[PDB]
Amino acid sequence: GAMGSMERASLIQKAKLAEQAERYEDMAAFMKGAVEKGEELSCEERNLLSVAYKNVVGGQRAAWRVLSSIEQKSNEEGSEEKGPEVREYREKVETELQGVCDTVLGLLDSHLIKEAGDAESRVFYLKMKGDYYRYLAEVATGDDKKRIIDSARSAYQEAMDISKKEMPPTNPIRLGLALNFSVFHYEIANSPEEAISLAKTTFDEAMADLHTLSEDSYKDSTLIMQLLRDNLTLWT
């Protein structure tokens, strides 16, 4: 890889600079290079990796949704035939999105997950695996769609099982995982009741554990709890 010649520490330094400059593609390339050094990532480093790729794929997803909407309107009754261009460009953006997802999943599989022994690292990586299979699922229309959905479900489920055993109900990683798995249920698995149940139970169990926290931990946990409440409000 093109980052092979750069020091791990320099790659991390530059990822931070890229974040400040809102250069998320660069940020992702630097973090990829860092991961490929083969050493485990710290908490802060894991965050840099996730931030970088979340922003890159987030932009791709937004673009894909715009194009998909235009494409769907083109195939409505009375719509004038404008040729293959809308499909082609949606496919281009889709292929790019899929490439990014495959890249992240690749890093997780080679070899971040297998070396992650602590609850916080293993849950975070499995959450990421769930997320990037969920993004693949959003654009999937073929033979492997069900298997993609199951790959997301399986990753989220393992993360859930570990998080329930090893982390307090207010742990931001546990909360973020639950938030996202709940969205998976609602948007991907056609299981809105599972989504609502998970969001509510997660919220209520966290509420009950807030008394144990410092002011700073309270702020962290309640921020994500509000997102759970936001989704519940949207869905009920």
């Binding site: 997320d131 938030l179 969205v183 609602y186 948007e187 936001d230 989704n231 949207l234 869905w235």
Partner: peptide
């Protein structure tokens, strides 16, 4: 769209 982190 719903919130994710």
């Amino acid at each position: 769209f719903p919130a994710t982190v």
